[PDB]
Design a protein around this ligand. Structure first.
Ligand SMILES: O=C(NO)c1ccc(Cl)c(NC(=O)c2cccc3ccsc23)c1
Ligand SMILES: [K+]
Ligand SMILES: [K+]
Ligand SMILES: [Zn+2]
Length: 399
């Protein structure tokens, strides 16, 4: 089946942050408004038998001191008094500040995404689901002891750790931003191949995933993980077709050579032409959306796959995209036509889809060849180092 992570408390917690507001509610309520819920298997978020068991799960990646600090941040933001200077310094030492502020539910909110994506991994492992979706997860910037980019706990790393320890995993990051936290976690691990496509330019967050600044070279992993971290930085303005042609052959070659046991896809929606970032020009169009082209290709591999959320700051349009991603997954996996009306159905958040109330977003539409050459050589090097065999010319022909 196709699983999807939701529940009543989970929804309250995913909607409890200042930055992402009620986005999760719009997403799940649009999927429900389109009558997709009866097609899907609800995956309940994971819950633990003790604080010690929760800490054991979370500190598989994060340091205990960082988890302790994130929990203290929540407790302090649940009292009226201001923080002491010592507590400000403590939070500064974990970057729990500026773009990663505290709020009264910051730990419960961050932990919830971990609970969802770990439960999603488990459903794939025990083969209850062939694909699982978690639109409350995808927080790819969080590091072992550092919050970053409004990501406080890295649910993706923790899910991938569960999958690999249950084996090779292919991680695909479609967000506008470089998936640096996941890349870094698995920098020395050849069994987790990471691939991020993103915008990169001077001063643009987080700054990695591109030529490294001697002449600038492309770092790609280290130790036994050399060649195992892949990146495709793109300049602004790219449309559906060109983004699709940019990553299509890379994805297909990665599946052919890696032969992964699991695929984890981060599907951050901030590449949409209508996102307030206004960098890329992707759509949710479905006759083609770069997102739907990528997800359809990945699902055609028939590999157990985790689909996560991530960025996306135009909430109605992020719901518009992820609702189509969800319908496509049902169609590809179950083999069962999904007929979505081009008009937003009436439901609690119908008014947020003004003024036209259509499912299509309100948008009217050499450097990549060099990257493909570089990426082909890296995949060959990765295959060489890891004693994987594959038709070189059949792979080279994909590009
Ligand atoms: O998604 C991220 N990583 O995958 C990510 C990480 C850090 C930041 Cl700073 C942003 N974006 C904004 O904070 C933002 C920028 C431009 C306009 C607007 C409107 C609402 S938020 C926003 C994104
Ligand atoms: K990305
Ligand atoms: K890696
Ligand atoms: Zn992003």
């Amino acid at each position: 089946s196709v699983g999807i992570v939701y529940g009543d408390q989970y929804r309250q917690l995913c909607c409890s942050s200042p930055k992402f507001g009620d986005r999760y509610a719009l997403v799940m309520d649009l999927i429900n408004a389109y009558k997709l819920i009866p097609e899907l298997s609800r995956v309940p978020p994971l819950q633990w038998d003790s604080p010690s068991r929760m800490y054991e799960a979370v500190t598989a990646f994060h340091s205990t001191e960082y988890v302790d600090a994130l929990k203290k941040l929540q407790m302090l933001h649940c009292e009226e008094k201001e923080l002491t200077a010592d507590d400000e310094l403590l939070m500064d030492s974990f970057s729990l500040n500026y773009d990663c502020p505290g709020f009264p539910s910051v730990f419960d909110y961050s932990l919830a995404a971990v609970q969802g994506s770990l439960a999603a991994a488990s459903a794939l492992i025990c083969r209850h689901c062939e694909v699982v979706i978690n639109w409350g997860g995808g927080w790819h910037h969080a590091k072992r002891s550092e919050a970053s980019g409004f990501c406080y706990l890295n649910d993706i790393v923790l899910a991938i750790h569960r999958l690999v320890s249950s084996t090779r995993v292919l991680y695909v990051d479609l967000d506008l931003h470089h998936g640096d936290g996941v890349e870094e976690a698995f920098w020395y691990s050849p069994r987790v191949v990471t691939f991020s496509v993103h915008h990169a330019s001077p001063g643009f967050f987080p700054g990695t995933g591109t030529w490294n600044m001697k002449l600038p070279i492309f770092l790609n992993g280290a130790g036994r993980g050399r060649f195992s971290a892949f990146n495709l930085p793109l300049e602004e303005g790219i449309n559906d077709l060109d983004w699709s042609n940019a990553i299509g052959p890379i994805l297909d070659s990665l599946n052919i050579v890696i032969q992964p046991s699991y695929v984890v896809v981060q599907c951050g929606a901030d590449c949409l032409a209508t996102d307030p970032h206004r960098i890329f020009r992707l759509t949710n169009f479905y006759p083609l959306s770069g997102y739907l082209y990528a997800i359809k290709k990945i699902l055609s591999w028939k590999v157990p796959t985790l689909i996560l959320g991530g960025g996306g700051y135009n909430f109605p349009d992020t719901a518009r995209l992820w609702t189509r991603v969800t319908a496509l997954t049902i169609e590809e996996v179950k083999g069962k036509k999904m007929t979505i009306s081009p008009e937003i159905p009436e439901h609690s958040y119908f008014s947020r889809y003004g003024p036209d109330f259509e499912l299509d977003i309100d948008y009217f539409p050499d450097s990549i060849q060099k990257h493909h050459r570089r990426i082909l050589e890296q995949l060959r090097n990765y295959a060489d180092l890891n004693k994987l065999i594959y038709d070189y010319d059949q792979v080279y022909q994909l590009y």
